[PDB]
Design a protein around this motif. Sequence first.
Motif, PDB file in Angstrom:
ATOM      1  N   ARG A  42     -11.878  89.463  -1.432  1.00 47.21           N
ATOM      2  CA  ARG A  42     -12.277  89.681  -0.181  1.00 47.21           C
ATOM      3  C   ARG A  42     -12.374  91.284   0.222  1.00 47.21           C
ATOM      4  NH1 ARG A  42      -9.422  85.715   2.192  1.00 47.21           N
ATOM      5  NH2 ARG A  42      -7.543  86.897   1.231  1.00 47.21           N
ATOM      6  N   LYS A  43     -13.492  91.846  -0.771  1.00 48.06           N
ATOM      7  CA  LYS A  43     -13.565  93.300  -0.463  1.00 48.06           C
ATOM      8  C   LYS A  43     -14.899  93.669  -1.039  1.00 48.06           C
ATOM      9  CE  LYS A  43     -10.672  96.440   0.739  1.00 48.06           C
ATOM     10  NZ  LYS A  43      -9.930  97.293  -0.250  1.00 48.06           N
ATOM     11  N   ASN A  44     -15.530  94.497  -0.238  1.00 50.14           N
ATOM     12  CA  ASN A  44     -17.187  94.850  -0.697  1.00 50.14           C
ATOM     13  C   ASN A  44     -17.227  96.214  -1.641  1.00 50.14           C
ATOM     14  OD1 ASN A  44     -18.715  93.677   1.799  1.00 50.14           O
ATOM     15  ND2 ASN A  44     -16.650  94.482   2.583  1.00 50.14           N
ATOM     16  N   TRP A  45     -16.731  95.784  -2.959  1.00 54.11           N
ATOM     17  CA  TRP A  45     -16.976  96.614  -4.014  1.00 54.11           C
ATOM     18  C   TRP A  45     -18.330  96.974  -4.391  1.00 54.11           C
ATOM     19  CZ3 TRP A  45     -12.346  98.385  -4.733  1.00 54.11           C
ATOM     20  CH2 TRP A  45     -11.260  97.341  -4.585  1.00 54.11           C
ATOM     21  N   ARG A  46     -18.483  98.459  -4.509  1.00 53.39           N
ATOM     22  CA  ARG A  46     -19.850  98.739  -5.108  1.00 53.39           C
ATOM     23  C   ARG A  46     -20.111  98.515  -6.397  1.00 53.39           C
ATOM     24  NH1 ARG A  46     -22.390 101.130  -0.636  1.00 53.39           N
ATOM     25  NH2 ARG A  46     -23.947 101.944  -1.988  1.00 53.39           N
ATOM     26  N   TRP A  56     -12.184  85.053 -16.439  1.00 52.36           N
ATOM     27  CA  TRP A  56     -13.766  84.645 -16.342  1.00 52.36           C
ATOM     28  C   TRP A  56     -13.726  84.224 -14.890  1.00 52.36           C
ATOM     29  CZ3 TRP A  56     -17.089  80.866 -15.327  1.00 52.36           C
ATOM     30  CH2 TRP A  56     -18.464  81.017 -15.384  1.00 52.36           C
ATOM     31  N   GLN A  57     -13.249  83.134 -14.573  1.00 58.22           N
ATOM     32  CA  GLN A  57     -13.171  82.406 -13.313  1.00 58.22           C
ATOM     33  C   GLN A  57     -12.636  83.286 -12.211  1.00 58.22           C
ATOM     34  OE1 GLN A  57     -12.695  81.281 -16.122  1.00 58.22           O
ATOM     35  NE2 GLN A  57     -12.589  78.977 -16.448  1.00 58.22           N
ATOM     36  N   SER A  58     -11.390  83.943 -12.450  1.00 54.72           N
ATOM     37  CA  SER A  58     -10.965  84.759 -11.386  1.00 54.72           C
ATOM     38  C   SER A  58     -11.693  85.852 -11.050  1.00 54.72           C
ATOM     39  CB  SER A  58      -9.393  85.288 -11.924  1.00 54.72           C
ATOM     40  OG  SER A  58      -8.735  86.043 -11.141  1.00 54.72           O
ATOM     41  N   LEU A  59     -12.359  86.498 -12.051  1.00 51.90           N
ATOM     42  CA  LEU A  59     -13.257  87.815 -11.779  1.00 51.90           C
ATOM     43  C   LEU A  59     -14.635  87.303 -11.584  1.00 51.90           C
ATOM     44  CD1 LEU A  59     -11.730  90.069 -14.595  1.00 51.90           C
ATOM     45  CD2 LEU A  59     -11.191  89.674 -12.042  1.00 51.90           C
ATOM     46  N   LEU A  60     -15.189  86.172 -11.933  1.00 51.09           N
ATOM     47  CA  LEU A  60     -16.417  85.631 -11.670  1.00 51.09           C
ATOM     48  C   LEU A  60     -17.178  85.978 -10.173  1.00 51.09           C
ATOM     49  CD1 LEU A  60     -19.067  84.407 -12.710  1.00 51.09           C
ATOM     50  CD2 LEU A  60     -18.357  82.244 -11.990  1.00 51.09           C
ATOM     51  N   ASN A  61     -16.354  85.532  -9.140  1.00 51.46           N
ATOM     52  CA  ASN A  61     -16.784  85.584  -7.778  1.00 51.46           C
ATOM     53  C   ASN A  61     -16.287  86.718  -6.830  1.00 51.46           C
ATOM     54  OD1 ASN A  61     -17.983  83.044  -7.889  1.00 51.46           O
ATOM     55  ND2 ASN A  61     -16.178  81.884  -7.342  1.00 51.46           N
ATOM     56  N   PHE A  62     -16.026  88.061  -7.711  1.00 54.17           N
ATOM     57  CA  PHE A  62     -15.586  89.084  -7.035  1.00 54.17           C
ATOM     58  C   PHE A  62     -16.922  89.808  -6.473  1.00 54.17           C
ATOM     59  CE2 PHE A  62     -11.564  88.971  -8.276  1.00 54.17           C
ATOM     60  CZ  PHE A  62     -10.856  90.154  -8.092  1.00 54.17           C
ATOM     61  N   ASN A  63     -16.742  89.749  -5.129  1.00 56.71           N
ATOM     62  CA  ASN A  63     -18.019  90.300  -4.219  1.00 56.71           C
ATOM     63  C   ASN A  63     -18.183  91.710  -4.928  1.00 56.71           C
ATOM     64  OD1 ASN A  63     -20.011  91.078  -2.440  1.00 56.71           O
ATOM     65  ND2 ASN A  63     -18.415  91.277  -0.594  1.00 56.71           N
ATOM     66  N   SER A  64     -19.321  92.249  -5.294  1.00 51.38           N
ATOM     67  CA  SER A  64     -19.686  93.378  -5.812  1.00 51.38           C
ATOM     68  C   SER A  64     -21.153  93.562  -5.772  1.00 51.38           C
ATOM     69  CB  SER A  64     -19.119  93.789  -7.160  1.00 51.38           C
ATOM     70  OG  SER A  64     -19.477  92.703  -8.266  1.00 51.38           O
ATOM     71  N   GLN A  65     -21.645  94.788  -5.962  1.00 53.94           N
ATOM     72  CA  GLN A  65     -23.045  95.094  -5.724  1.00 53.94           C
ATOM     73  C   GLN A  65     -23.562  95.047  -7.161  1.00 53.94           C
ATOM     74  OE1 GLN A  65     -23.626  98.471  -3.255  1.00 53.94           O
ATOM     75  NE2 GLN A  65     -22.582  97.647  -1.489  1.00 53.94           N
TER      76      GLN A  65
END
Length: 48
Positions: free
Chosen positions: A13-17, A35-44
Amino acid sequence: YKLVLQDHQAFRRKNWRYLILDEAQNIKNFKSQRWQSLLNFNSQRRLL
DNA sequence: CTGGAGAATCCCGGTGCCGAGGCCGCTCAATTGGTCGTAGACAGCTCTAGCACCGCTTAAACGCACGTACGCGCTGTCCCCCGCGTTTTAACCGCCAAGGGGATTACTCCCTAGTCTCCAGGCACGTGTCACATATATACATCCTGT
């Protein structure tokens, strides 16, 4: 990875650019819990 | 007994993750309809306990009195768990071969088991005694008394 893997609740839950992953070979397969843990990381933008 | 910190909670609002709920589509299992022997219910009949006494006997429960012994509190002090910080380590990964180990489904088949006989022998019941317990003659056996 030894850290973000289990603390994803705070980073997900963070707005990474820009998301940068060094030595992406640790994400070689999608059966490894990263792969799963990092897949849905909110990032632009994403960089491997 | 307050301060004065100081952590700990703990409101409270936020946000995606994923179980909870729902909807769809068949399968199967409960319903329907109907027939068919029992289950057990109910109406007697018997006679076994259950209950209810009553009396005599006495164990026993019981209250009291009376210590002693054990219970509780107190105290001292002295070990061994608590709180907390550091080094260790095991528990999570991730890796890299290539395939099976074993619950699960299914189909014949076939021994095993129900059903249902007729019997007859072996086990509940009635009766014959024998081991232990009971109550009473008895041949002396110890005071009492004429003497």
